[PDB]
PDB file of N, CA, C and O in Angstrom:
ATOM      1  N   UNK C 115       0.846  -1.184   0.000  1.00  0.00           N
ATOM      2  CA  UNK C 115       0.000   0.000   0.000  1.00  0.00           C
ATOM      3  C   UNK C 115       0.884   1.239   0.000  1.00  0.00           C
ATOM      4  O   UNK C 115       1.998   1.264   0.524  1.00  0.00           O
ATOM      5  N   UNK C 116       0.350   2.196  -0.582  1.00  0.00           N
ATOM      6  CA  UNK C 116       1.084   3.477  -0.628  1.00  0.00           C
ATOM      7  C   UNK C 116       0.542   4.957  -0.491  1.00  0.00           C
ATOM      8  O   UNK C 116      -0.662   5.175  -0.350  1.00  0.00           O
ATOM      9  N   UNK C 117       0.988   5.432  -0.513  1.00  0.00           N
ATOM     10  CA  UNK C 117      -0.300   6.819  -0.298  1.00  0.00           C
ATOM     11  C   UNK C 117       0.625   8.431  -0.594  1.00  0.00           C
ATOM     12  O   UNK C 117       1.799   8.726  -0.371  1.00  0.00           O
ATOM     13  N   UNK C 118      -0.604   9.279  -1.225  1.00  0.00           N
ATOM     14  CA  UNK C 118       0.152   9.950  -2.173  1.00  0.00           C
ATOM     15  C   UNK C 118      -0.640  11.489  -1.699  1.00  0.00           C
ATOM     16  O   UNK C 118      -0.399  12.608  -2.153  1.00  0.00           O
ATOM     17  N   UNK C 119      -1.549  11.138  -0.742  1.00  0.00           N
ATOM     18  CA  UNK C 119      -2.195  12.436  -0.366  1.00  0.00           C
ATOM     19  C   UNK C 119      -1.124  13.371   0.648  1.00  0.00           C
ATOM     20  O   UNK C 119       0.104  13.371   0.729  1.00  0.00           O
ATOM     21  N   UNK C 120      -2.523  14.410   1.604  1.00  0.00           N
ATOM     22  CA  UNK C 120      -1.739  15.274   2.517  1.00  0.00           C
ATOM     23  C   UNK C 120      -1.908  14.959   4.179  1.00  0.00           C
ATOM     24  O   UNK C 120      -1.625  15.691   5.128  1.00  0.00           O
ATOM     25  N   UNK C 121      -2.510  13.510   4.164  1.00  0.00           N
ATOM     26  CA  UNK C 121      -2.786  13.475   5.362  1.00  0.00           C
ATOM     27  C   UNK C 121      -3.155  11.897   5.898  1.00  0.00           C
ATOM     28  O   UNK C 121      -4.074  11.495   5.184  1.00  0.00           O
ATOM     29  N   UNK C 122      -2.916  11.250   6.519  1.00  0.00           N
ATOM     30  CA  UNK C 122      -2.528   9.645   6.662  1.00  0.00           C
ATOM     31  C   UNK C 122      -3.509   9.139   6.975  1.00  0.00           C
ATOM     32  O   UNK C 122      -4.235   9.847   7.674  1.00  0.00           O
ATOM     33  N   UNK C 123      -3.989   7.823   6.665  1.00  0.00           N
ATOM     34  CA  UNK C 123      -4.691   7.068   7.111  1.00  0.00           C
ATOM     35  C   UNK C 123      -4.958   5.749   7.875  1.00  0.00           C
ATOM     36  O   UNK C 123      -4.339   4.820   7.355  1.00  0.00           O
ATOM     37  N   UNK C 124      -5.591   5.434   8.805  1.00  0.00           N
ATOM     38  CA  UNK C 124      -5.414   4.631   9.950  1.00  0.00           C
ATOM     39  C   UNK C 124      -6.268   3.436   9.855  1.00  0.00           C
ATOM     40  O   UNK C 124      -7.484   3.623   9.897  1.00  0.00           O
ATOM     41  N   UNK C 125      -5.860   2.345   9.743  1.00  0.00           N
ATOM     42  CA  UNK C 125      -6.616   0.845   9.557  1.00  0.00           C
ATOM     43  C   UNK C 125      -7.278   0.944   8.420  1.00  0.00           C
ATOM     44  O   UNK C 125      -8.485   1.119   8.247  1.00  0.00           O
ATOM     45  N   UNK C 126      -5.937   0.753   7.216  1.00  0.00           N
ATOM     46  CA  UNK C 126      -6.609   0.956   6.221  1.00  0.00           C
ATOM     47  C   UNK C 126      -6.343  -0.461   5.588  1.00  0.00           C
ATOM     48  O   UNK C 126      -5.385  -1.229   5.670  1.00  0.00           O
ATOM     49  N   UNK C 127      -7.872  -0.537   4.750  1.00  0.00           N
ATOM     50  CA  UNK C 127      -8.662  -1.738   4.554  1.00  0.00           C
ATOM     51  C   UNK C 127      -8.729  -1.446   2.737  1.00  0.00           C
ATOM     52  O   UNK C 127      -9.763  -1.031   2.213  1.00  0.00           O
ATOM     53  N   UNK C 128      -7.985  -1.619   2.268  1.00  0.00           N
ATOM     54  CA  UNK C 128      -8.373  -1.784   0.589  1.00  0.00           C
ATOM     55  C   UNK C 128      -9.340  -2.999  -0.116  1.00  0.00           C
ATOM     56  O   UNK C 128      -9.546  -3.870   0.729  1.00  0.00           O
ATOM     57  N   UNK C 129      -9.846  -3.241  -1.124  1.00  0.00           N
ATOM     58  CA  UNK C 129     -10.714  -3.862  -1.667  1.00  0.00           C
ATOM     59  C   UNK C 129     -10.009  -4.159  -3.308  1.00  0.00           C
ATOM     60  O   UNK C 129      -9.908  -3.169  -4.033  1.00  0.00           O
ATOM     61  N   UNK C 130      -9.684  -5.096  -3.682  1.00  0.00           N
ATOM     62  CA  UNK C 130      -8.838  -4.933  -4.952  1.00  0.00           C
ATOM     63  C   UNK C 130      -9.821  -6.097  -5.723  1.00  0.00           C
ATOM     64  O   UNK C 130     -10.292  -7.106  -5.199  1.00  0.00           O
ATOM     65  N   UNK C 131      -9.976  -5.662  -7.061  1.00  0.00           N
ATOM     66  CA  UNK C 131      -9.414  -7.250  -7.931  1.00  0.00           C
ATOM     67  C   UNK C 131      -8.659  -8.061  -8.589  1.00  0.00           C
ATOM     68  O   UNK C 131      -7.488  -7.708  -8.735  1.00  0.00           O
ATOM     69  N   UNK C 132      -9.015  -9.133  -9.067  1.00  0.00           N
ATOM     70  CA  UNK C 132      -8.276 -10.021  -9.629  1.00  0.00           C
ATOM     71  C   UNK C 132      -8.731 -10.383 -11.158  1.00  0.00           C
ATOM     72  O   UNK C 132      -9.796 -11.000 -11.194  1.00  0.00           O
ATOM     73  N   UNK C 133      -8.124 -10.117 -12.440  1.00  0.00           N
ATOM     74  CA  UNK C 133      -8.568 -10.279 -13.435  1.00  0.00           C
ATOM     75  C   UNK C 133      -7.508 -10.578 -14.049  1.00  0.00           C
ATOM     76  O   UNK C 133      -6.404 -10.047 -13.919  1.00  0.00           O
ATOM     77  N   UNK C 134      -8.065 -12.157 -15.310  1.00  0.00           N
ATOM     78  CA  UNK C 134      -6.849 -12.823 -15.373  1.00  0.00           C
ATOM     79  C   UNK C 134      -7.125 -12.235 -16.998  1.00  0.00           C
ATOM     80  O   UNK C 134      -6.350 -11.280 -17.057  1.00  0.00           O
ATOM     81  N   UNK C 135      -7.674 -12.307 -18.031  1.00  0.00           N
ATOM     82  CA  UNK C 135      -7.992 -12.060 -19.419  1.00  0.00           C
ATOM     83  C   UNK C 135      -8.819 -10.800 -19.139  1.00  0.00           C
ATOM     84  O   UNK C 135      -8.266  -9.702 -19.070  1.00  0.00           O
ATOM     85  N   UNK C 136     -10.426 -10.983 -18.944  1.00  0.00           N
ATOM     86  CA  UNK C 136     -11.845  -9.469 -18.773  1.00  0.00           C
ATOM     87  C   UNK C 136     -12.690 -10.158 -17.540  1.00  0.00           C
ATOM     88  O   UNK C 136     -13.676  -9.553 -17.119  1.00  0.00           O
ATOM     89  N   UNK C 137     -12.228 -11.703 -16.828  1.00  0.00           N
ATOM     90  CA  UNK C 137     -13.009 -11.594 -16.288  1.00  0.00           C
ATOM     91  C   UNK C 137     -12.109 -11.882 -14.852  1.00  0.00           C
ATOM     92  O   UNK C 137     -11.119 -12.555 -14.567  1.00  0.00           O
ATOM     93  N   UNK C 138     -13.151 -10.868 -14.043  1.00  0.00           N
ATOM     94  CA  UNK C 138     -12.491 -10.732 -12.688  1.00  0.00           C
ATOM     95  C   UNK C 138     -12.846 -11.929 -11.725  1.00  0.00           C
ATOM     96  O   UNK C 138     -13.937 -12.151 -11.201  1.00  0.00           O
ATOM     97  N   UNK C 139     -11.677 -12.647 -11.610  1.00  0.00           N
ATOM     98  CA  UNK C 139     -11.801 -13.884 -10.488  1.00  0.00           C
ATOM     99  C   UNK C 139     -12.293 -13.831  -9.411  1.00  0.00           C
ATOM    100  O   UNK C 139     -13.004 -14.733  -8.966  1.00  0.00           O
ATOM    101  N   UNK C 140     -11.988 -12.680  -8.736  1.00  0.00           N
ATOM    102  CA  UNK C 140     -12.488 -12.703  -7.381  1.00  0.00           C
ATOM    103  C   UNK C 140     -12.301 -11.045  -6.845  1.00  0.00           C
ATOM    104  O   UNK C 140     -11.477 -10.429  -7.522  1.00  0.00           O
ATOM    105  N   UNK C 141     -12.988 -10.205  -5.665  1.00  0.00           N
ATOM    106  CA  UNK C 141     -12.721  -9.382  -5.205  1.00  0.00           C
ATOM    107  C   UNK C 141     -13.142  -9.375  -3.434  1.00  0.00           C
ATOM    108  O   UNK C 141     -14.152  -9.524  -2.747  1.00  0.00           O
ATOM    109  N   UNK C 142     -11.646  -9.097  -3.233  1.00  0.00           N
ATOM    110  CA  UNK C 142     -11.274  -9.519  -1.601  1.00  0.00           C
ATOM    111  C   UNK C 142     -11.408  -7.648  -0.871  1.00  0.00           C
ATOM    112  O   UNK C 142     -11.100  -6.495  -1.175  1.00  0.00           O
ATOM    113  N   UNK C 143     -11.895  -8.215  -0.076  1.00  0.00           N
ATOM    114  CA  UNK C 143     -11.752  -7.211   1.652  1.00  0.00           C
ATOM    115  C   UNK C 143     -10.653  -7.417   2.497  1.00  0.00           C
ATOM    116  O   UNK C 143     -10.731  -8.407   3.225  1.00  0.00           O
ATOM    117  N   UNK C 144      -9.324  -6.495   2.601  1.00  0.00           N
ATOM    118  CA  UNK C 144      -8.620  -7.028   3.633  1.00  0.00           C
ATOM    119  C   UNK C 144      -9.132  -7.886   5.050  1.00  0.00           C
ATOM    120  O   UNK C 144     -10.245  -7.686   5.536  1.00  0.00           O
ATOM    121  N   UNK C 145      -8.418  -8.597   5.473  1.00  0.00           N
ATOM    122  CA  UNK C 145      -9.109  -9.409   6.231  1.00  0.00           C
ATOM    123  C   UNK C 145      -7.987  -8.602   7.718  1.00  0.00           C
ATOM    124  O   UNK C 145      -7.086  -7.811   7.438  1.00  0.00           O
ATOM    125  N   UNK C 146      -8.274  -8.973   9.059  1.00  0.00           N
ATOM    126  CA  UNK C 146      -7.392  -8.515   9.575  1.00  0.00           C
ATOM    127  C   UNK C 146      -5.719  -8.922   9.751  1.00  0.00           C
ATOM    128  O   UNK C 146      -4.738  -8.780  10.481  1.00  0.00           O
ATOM    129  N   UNK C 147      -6.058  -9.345   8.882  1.00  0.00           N
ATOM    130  CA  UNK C 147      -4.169 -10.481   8.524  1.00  0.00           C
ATOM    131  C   UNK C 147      -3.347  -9.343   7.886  1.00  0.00           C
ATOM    132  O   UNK C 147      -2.190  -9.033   8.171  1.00  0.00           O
ATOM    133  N   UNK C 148      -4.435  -8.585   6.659  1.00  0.00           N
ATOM    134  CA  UNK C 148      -3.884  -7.219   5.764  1.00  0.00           C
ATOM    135  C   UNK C 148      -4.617  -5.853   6.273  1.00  0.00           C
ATOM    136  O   UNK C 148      -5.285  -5.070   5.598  1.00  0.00           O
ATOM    137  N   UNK C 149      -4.457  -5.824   6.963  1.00  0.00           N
ATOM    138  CA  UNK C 149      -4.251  -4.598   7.864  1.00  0.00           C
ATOM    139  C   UNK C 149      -3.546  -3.545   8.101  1.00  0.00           C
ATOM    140  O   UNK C 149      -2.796  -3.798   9.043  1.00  0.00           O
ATOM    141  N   UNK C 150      -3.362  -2.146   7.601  1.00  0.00           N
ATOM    142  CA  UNK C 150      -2.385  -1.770   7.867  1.00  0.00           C
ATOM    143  C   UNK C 150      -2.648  -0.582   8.977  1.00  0.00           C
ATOM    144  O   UNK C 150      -3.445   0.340   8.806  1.00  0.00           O
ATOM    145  N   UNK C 151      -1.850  -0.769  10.120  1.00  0.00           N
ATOM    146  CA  UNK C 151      -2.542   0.022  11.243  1.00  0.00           C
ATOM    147  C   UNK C 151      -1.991   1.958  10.522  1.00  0.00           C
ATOM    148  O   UNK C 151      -2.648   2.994  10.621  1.00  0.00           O
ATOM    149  N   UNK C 152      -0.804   1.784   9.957  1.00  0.00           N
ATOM    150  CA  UNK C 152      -0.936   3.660   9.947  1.00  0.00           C
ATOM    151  C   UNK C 152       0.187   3.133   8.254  1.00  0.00           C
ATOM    152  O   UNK C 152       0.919   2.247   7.812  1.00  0.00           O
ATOM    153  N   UNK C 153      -0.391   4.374   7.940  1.00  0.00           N
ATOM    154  CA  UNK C 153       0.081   4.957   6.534  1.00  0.00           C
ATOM    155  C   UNK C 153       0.131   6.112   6.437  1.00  0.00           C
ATOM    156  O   UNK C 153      -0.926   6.648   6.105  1.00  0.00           O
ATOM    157  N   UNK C 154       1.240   6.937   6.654  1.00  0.00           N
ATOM    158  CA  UNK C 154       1.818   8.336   6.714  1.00  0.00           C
ATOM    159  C   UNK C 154       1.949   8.813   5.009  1.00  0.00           C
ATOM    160  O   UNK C 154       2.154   7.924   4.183  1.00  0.00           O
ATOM    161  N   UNK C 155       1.840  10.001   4.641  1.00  0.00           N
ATOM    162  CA  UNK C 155       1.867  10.575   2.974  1.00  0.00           C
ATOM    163  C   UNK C 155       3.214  10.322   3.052  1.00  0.00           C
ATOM    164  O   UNK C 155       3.990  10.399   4.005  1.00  0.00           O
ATOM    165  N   UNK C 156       3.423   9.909   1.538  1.00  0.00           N
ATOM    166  CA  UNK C 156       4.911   9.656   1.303  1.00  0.00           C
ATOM    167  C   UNK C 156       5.379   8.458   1.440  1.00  0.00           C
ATOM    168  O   UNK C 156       6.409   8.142   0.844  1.00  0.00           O
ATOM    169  N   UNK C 157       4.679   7.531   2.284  1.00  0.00           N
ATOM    170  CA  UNK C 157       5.158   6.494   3.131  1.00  0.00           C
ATOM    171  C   UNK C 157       4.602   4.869   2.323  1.00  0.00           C
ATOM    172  O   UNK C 157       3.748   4.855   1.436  1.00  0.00           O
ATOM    173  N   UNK C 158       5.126   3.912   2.727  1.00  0.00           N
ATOM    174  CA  UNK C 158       4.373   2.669   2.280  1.00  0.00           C
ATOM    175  C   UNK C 158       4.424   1.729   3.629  1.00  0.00           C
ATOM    176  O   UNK C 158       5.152   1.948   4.597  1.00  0.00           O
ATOM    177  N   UNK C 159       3.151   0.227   3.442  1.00  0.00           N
ATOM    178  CA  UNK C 159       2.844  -0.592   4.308  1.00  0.00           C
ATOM    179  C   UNK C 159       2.929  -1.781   3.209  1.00  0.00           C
ATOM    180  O   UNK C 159       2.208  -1.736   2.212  1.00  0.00           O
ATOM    181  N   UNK C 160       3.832  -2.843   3.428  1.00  0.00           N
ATOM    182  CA  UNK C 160       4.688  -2.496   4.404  1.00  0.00           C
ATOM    183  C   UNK C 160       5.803  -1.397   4.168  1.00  0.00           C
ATOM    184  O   UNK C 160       5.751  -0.760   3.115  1.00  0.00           O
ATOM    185  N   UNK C 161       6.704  -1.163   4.989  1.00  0.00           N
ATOM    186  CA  UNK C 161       8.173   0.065   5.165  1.00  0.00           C
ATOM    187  C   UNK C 161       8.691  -0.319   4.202  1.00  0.00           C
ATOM    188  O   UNK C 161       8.484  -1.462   3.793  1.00  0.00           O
ATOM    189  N   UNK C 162       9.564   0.596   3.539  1.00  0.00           N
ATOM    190  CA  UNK C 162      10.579  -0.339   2.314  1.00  0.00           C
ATOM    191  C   UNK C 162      11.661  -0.720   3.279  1.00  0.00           C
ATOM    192  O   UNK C 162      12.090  -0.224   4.321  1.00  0.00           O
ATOM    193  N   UNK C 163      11.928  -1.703   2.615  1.00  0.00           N
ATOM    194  CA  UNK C 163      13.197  -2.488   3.272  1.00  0.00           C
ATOM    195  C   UNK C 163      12.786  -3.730   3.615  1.00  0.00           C
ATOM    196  O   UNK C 163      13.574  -4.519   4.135  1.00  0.00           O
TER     197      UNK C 163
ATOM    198  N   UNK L 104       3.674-100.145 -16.296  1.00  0.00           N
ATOM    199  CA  UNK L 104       4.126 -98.778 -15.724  1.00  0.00           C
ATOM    200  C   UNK L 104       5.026 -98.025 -16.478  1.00  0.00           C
ATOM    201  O   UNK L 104       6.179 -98.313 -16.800  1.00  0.00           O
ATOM    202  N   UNK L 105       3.840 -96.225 -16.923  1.00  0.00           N
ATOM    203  CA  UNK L 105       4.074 -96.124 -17.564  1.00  0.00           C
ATOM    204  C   UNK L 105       4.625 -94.538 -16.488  1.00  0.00           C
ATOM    205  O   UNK L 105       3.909 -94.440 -15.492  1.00  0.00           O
ATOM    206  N   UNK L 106       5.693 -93.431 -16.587  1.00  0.00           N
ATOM    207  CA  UNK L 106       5.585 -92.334 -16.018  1.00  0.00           C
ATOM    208  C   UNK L 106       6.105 -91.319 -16.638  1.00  0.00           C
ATOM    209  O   UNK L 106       6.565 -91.532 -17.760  1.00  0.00           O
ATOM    210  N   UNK L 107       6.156 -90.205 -16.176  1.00  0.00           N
ATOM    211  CA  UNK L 107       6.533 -89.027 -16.822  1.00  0.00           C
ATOM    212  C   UNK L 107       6.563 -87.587 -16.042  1.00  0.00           C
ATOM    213  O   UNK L 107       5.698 -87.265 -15.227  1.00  0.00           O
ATOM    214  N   UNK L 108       7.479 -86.913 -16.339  1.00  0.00           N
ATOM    215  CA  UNK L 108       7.842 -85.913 -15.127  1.00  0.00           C
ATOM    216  C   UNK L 108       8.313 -84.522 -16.056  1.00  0.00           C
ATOM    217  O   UNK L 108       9.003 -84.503 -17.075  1.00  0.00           O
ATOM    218  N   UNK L 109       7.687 -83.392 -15.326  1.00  0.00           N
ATOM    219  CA  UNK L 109       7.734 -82.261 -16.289  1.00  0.00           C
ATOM    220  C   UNK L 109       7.554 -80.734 -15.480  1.00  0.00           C
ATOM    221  O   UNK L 109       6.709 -80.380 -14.658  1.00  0.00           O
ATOM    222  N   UNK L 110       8.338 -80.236 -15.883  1.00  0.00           N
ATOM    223  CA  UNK L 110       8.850 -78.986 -14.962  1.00  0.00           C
ATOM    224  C   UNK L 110       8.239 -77.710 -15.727  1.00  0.00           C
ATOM    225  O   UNK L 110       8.819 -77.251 -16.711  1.00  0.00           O
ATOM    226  N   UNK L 111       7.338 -77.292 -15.356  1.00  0.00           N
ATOM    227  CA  UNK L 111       7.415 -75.621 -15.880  1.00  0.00           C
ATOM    228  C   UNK L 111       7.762 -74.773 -15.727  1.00  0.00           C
ATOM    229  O   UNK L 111       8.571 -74.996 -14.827  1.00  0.00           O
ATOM    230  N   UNK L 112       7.810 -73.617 -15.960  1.00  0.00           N
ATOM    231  CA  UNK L 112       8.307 -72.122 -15.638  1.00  0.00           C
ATOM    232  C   UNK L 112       7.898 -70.923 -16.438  1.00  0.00           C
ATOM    233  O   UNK L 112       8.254 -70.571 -17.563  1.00  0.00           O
ATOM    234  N   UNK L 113       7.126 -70.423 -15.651  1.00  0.00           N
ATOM    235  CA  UNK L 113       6.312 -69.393 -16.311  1.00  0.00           C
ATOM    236  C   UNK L 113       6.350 -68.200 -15.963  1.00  0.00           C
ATOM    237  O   UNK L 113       5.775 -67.890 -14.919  1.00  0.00           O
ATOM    238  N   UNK L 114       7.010 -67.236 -16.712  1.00  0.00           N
ATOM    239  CA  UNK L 114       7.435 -65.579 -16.288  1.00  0.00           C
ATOM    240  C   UNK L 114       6.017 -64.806 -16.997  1.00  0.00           C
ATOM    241  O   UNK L 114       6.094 -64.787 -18.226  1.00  0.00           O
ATOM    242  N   UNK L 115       5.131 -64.362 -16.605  1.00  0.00           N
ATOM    243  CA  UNK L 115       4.350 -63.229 -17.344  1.00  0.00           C
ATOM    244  C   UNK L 115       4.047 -61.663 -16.260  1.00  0.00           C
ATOM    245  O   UNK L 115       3.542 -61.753 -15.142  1.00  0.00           O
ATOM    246  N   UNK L 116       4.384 -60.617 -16.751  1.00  0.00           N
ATOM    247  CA  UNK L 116       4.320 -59.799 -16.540  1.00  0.00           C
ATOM    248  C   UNK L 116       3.397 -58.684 -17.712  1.00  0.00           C
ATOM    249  O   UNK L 116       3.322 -58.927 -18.917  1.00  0.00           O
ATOM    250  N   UNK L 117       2.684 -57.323 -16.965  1.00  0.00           N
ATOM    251  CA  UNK L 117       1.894 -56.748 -17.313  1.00  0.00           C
ATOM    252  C   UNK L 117       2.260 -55.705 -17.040  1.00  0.00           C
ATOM    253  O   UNK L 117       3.301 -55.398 -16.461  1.00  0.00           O
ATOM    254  N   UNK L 118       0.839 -54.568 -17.715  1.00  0.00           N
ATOM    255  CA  UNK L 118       0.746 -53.340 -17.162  1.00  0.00           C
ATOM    256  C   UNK L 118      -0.751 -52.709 -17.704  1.00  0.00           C
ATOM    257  O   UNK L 118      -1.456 -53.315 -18.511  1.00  0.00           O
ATOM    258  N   UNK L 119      -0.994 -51.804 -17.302  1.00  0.00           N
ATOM    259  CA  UNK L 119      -2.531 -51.298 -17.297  1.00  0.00           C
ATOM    260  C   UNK L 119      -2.429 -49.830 -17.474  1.00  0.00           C
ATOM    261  O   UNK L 119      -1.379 -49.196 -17.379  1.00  0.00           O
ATOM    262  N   UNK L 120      -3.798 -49.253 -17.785  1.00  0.00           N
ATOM    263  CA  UNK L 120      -4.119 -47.448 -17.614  1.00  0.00           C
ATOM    264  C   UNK L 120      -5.320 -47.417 -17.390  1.00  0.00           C
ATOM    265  O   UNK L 120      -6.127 -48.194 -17.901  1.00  0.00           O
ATOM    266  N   UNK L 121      -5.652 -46.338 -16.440  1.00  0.00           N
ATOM    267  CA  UNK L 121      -7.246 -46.402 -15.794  1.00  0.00           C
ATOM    268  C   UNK L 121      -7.156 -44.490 -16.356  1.00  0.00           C
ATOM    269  O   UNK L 121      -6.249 -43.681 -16.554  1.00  0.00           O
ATOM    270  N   UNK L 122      -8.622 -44.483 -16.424  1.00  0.00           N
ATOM    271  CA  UNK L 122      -9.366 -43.263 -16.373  1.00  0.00           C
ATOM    272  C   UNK L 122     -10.253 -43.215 -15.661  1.00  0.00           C
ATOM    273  O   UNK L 122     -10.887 -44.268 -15.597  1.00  0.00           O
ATOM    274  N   UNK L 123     -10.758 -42.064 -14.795  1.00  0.00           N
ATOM    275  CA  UNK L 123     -11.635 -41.993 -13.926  1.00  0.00           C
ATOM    276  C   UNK L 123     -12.485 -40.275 -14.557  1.00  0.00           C
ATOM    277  O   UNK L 123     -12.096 -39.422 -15.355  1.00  0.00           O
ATOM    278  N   UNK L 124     -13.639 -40.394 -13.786  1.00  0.00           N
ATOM    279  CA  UNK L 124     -14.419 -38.699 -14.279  1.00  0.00           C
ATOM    280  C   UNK L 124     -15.814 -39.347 -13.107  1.00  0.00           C
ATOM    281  O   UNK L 124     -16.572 -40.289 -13.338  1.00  0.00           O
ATOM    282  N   UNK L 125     -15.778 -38.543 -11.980  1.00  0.00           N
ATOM    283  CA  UNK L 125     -16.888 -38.743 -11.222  1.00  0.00           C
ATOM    284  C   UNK L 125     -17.247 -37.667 -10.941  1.00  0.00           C
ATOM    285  O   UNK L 125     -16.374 -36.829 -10.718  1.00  0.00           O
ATOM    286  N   UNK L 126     -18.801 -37.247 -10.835  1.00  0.00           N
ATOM    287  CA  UNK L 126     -19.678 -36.097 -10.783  1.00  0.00           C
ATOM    288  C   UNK L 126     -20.490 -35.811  -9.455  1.00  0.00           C
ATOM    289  O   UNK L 126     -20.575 -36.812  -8.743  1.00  0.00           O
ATOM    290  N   UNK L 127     -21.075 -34.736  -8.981  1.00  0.00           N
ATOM    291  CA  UNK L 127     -21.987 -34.403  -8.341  1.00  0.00           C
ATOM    292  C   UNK L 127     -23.263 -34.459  -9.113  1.00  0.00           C
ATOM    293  O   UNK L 127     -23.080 -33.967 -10.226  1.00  0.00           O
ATOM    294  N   UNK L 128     -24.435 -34.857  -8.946  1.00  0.00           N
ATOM    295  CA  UNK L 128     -25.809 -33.767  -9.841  1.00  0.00           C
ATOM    296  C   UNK L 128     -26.216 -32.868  -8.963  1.00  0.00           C
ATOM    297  O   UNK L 128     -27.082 -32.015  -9.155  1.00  0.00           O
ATOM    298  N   UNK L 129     -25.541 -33.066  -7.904  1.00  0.00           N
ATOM    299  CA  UNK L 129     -26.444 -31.650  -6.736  1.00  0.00           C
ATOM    300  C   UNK L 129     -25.750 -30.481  -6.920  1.00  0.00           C
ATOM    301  O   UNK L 129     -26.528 -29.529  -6.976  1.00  0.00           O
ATOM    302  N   UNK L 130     -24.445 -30.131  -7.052  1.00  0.00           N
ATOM    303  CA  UNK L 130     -23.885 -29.759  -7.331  1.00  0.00           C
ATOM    304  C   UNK L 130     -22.975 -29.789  -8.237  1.00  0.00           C
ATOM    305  O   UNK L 130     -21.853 -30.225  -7.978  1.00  0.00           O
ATOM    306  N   UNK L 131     -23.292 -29.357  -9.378  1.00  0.00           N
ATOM    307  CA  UNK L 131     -22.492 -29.752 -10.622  1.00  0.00           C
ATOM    308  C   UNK L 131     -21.374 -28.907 -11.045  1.00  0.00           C
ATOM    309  O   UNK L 131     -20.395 -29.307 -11.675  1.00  0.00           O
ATOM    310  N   UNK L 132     -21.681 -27.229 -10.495  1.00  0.00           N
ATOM    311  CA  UNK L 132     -20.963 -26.248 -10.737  1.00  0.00           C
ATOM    312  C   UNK L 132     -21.360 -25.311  -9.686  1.00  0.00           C
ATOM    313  O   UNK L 132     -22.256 -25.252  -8.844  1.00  0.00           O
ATOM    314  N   UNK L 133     -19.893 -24.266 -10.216  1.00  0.00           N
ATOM    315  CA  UNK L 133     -20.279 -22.928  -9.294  1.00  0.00           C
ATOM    316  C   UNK L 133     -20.205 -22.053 -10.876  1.00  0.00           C
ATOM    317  O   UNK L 133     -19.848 -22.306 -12.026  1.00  0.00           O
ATOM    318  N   UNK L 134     -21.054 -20.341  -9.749  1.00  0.00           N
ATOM    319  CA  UNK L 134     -21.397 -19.640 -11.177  1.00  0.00           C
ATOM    320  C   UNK L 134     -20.654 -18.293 -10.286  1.00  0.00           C
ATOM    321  O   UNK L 134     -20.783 -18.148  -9.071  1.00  0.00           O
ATOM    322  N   UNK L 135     -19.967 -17.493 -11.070  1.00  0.00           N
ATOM    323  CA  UNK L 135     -19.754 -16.211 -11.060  1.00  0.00           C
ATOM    324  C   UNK L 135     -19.904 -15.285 -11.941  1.00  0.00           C
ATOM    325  O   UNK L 135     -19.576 -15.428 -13.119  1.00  0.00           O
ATOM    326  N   UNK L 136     -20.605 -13.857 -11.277  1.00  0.00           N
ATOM    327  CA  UNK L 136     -20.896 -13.185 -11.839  1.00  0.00           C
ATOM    328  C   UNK L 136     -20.585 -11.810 -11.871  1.00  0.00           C
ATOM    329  O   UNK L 136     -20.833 -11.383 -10.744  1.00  0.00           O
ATOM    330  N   UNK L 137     -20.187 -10.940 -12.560  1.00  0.00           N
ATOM    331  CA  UNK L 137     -19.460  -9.423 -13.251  1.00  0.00           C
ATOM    332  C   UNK L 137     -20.380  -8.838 -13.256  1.00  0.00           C
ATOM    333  O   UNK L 137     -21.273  -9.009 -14.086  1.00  0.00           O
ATOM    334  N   UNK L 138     -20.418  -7.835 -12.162  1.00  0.00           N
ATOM    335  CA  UNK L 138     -21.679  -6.718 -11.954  1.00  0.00           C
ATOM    336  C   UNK L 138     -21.257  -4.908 -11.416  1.00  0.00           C
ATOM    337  O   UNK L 138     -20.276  -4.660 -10.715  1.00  0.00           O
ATOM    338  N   UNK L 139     -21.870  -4.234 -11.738  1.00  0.00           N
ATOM    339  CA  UNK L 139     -21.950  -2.722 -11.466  1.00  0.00           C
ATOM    340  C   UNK L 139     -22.863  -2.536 -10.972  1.00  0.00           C
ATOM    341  O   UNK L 139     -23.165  -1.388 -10.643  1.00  0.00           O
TER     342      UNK L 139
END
């Protein structure tokens, strides 16, 4: 996750899909396994490194 | 008296191929569906 705004966000929960050719396999809810408790602007989850 | 004596020996060996395909009818499939 990454974030490109002016101001961070806290237990953030994305929703993505999966599309292999036009049709989308599946679309997931982070579960609390993908969780990311803080995401600062500028910053990524996980940290680089 | 008449006799007679006789030894066999018999090597046979094999081999085989199976196919299998077993079904549900209660469940035959799943369905997904692409919506807005």
């Amino acid at each position: 996750y990454y974030n490109t705004g002016t101001a961070p966000m806290y237990k953030v929960t994305p929703t993505t899909n999966l599309v292999l050719d036009g049709d989308t396999l599946s679309t997931i809810k982070a579960q609390e396994n993908q969780i990311g408790n803080n995401l600062s602007p500028g910053d990524t989850y996980p940290k680089k490194g | 008296h008449t006799t007679d004596n006789s030894t066999a020996v018999q090597d046979s060996n094999g081999e085989s191929w199976n196919t299998g395909l077993s079904i549900n009818k209660g469940e035959s499939a799943y369905i997904n569906a692409n919506v807005r």
